[PDB]
Symmetry: C2
Subunit: 89 residues, 2 copies
């Protein structure tokens, strides 16, 4: 496994009411930005991911544009949501 502990913990179970900070790649700095933009729960971000038809380029771009995530951070968050969906959607 080369994933973050955060990734493993998030992909292992339904997300429910988890804050955006539970997402892999989303540390406190990106988290605060997301929240201020209205993305206050991981499921709201899951929502954007689905509205964008799980497209990697658009989602990672959306993340960069919304909270200034870098390549590694957006890749980690994308991977997190992709795997979660493969497991529970």
């Amino acid at each position: 496994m080369t994933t973050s502990q955060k990734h493993r913990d998030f992909v292992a179970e339904p997300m429910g009411e988890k804050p955006v900070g539970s997402l892999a790649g989303i540390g406190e700095v990106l988290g605060k930005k997301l929240e201020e933009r209205g993305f206050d729960k991981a499921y709201v971000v899951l929502g954007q991911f689905l509205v964008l038809k799980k497209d990697e380029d658009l989602f990672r771009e959306w993340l960069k544009d919304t909270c200034g995530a870098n390549a590694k951070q957006s890749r980690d968050c994308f991977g997190c949501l992709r795997e979660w969906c493969d497991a529970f959607l």
Copy 2:
């Protein structure tokens, strides 16, 4: 308080189901949603979640997007709401 289409949807993961699998989304609404880029039910789940599961906003969004009436929006909303209670 529900149709069997509703119960069938709410009982399992939605995977790649078309939008037409959603309670209240018939062929007419389904075509209209597809033309707007909402082809799979999970994309509509996406909008539901982006709107924070808000009934009024989601139902109004559905109406504005495909012209669903009061009953059709009610059924679709209830469908996505219960599915989330079960799997989200």
